[PDB]
Amino acid sequence: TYQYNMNFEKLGKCIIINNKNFDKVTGMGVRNGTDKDAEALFKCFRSLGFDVIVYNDCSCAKMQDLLKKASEEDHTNAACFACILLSHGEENVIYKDGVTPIKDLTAHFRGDRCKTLLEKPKLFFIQACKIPVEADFLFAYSTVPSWRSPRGSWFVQALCSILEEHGKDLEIMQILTRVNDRVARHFEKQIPCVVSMLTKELYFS
């Protein structure tokens, strides 16, 4: 009644987009330490039970296609969908070939755009610098409208320890709130931001 139904054959798909090297036309430097971060994210979200696929050095077009393709798949036997974006960024936009609006990457999974994902949580984790259409989305941004150690990012390191120990026993908002704290404390600043349009409590169990 107050939790998202998790009784499905699959937890869901999890797309991890890992942008480390950019074209000299973009003028972004090689993002050292992002391979440690991703490897972790991969083990955690795999532990949670996601079908994870890591794509490296995507382009604006590759990303838009990857997500449009994912949204055009059949999620009937999936509990939810997760997508994690690691890259450079500016206000409302993510960055190998240029810049794409977060609104474009998410829209594909809007209600009508993906009837097979309706009433299911859509989680987007972004690390960088009738029923409604935009409901049941959740965005965890690494900072508000971000630092990385050539050990991995603070946001991701935190997120991974919490998920390792409590991913199966805490609600998504509890987890994310604990991540917010660690980041803030270790910060030696930046505070992550959680945007929730979820309509239920999310437990990976």
């Binding site: 993002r31 050292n32 330490g33 450079h88 960024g89 960088a128 610098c129 971000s146 630092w147 990385r148 150690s149 050539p150 603070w154």
Partner: peptide, 4 residues
């Protein structure tokens, strides 16, 4: 750290 670095930056980003």
């Amino acid at each position: 750290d670095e930056v980003x």
